[PDB]
Ligand binder design. Structure first.
Ligand SMILES: [Ca+2]
Ligand SMILES: [Ca+2]
Length: 172
């Protein structure tokens, strides 16, 4: 139901596809529109390897979501299994150049379209690698978000698919 509960839309694909793709070392990416949980969805196909890299990216219309508690998507593994991800979010630079801090998940879907509400208290840093104009607040700042990033935690050739990408408020 609209305008009655504490959720706000990030992307439900009813426009033009703004998302990134890239690869190397024998892996591949293909992003395309499909049918989803309301109107259209998005599917993403891959080849995967072990020592390579394969990726898809989004830049947000809002990055100032301190009052919100969770992300949500309705998502499945359409590779032939149920495969996991180590996916990433960037904080804004305190020098106004590059990025400010890097923060990540470890999570898995299944083979069917479940809603996956994940809170801000899920995360840890990207621990090899951080910016020169950095934040050191000891935490992720939802006040201060720049961009979001796919990262590999499986080596499959296969697919994944979504609709309904949102922010969710508290449960009080
Ligand atoms: Ca949709
Ligand atoms: Ca921070």
């Amino acid at each position: 139901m609209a305008s009655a509960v504490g959720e706000k839309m990030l992307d439900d694909f009813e426009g033009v596809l703004n998302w990134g793709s890239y690869s190397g070392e024998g892996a591949k990416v293909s992003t395309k529109i499909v049918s989803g949980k309301t109107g259209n969805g998005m599917e993403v196909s891959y080849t995967g390897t072990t020592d390579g890299y394969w990726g898809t990216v989004y830049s947000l219309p809002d990055g100032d979501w301190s009052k919100w508690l969770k992300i949500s998507f309705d998502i499945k593994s359409v590779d032939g299994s149920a495969n996991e991800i180590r996916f990433m979010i960037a904080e804004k630079s305190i020098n106004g150049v590059g990025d400010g801090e890097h923060w990540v998940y470890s999570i898995t879907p299944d083979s069917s379209w479940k809603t996956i509400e994940i809170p801000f208290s899920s995360f840890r840093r990207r621990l090899d690698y951080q910016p020169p104009g950095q934040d050191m607040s000891g935490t992720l700042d939802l006040d201060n978000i720049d961009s979001i990033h796919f990262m590999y935690a499986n080596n499959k050739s296969g697919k994944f698919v979504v609709d309904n990408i949102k922010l969710i408020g508290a449960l009080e």
